[PDB]
Design a protein around this ligand. Structure first.
Ligand SMILES: CCCCCCCC/C=C/CCCCCCCC(=O)OC[C@@H](O)CO
Lengths: 29, 29
């Protein structure tokens, strides 16, 4: 199903972006 | 369009799961 793979890809991206943002906070700020 | 919403929904859901993983790994480890 296309709606499920779209959600799973978002969940993976959302989890990565959250850790990526904190990484930017520790290194840039 | 429904795929974009499902993607964005997963992204914001992923940001919650990231802090949920840190919570469980603090308890587990
Ligand atoms: C087409 C239907 C698709 C259904 C998909 C359902 C996915 C359900 C998602 C489950 C993940 C729930 C994550 C829930 C995360 C809640 C926030 C949390 O745990 O914060 C931790 C802090 O309080 C620690 O101090």
């Amino acid at each position: 199903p296309e709606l499920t793979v779209a959600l799973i890809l978002g969940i993976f991206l959302g989890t990565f972006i959250a850790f990526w943002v904190v990484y930017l906070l520790r290194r840039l700020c």
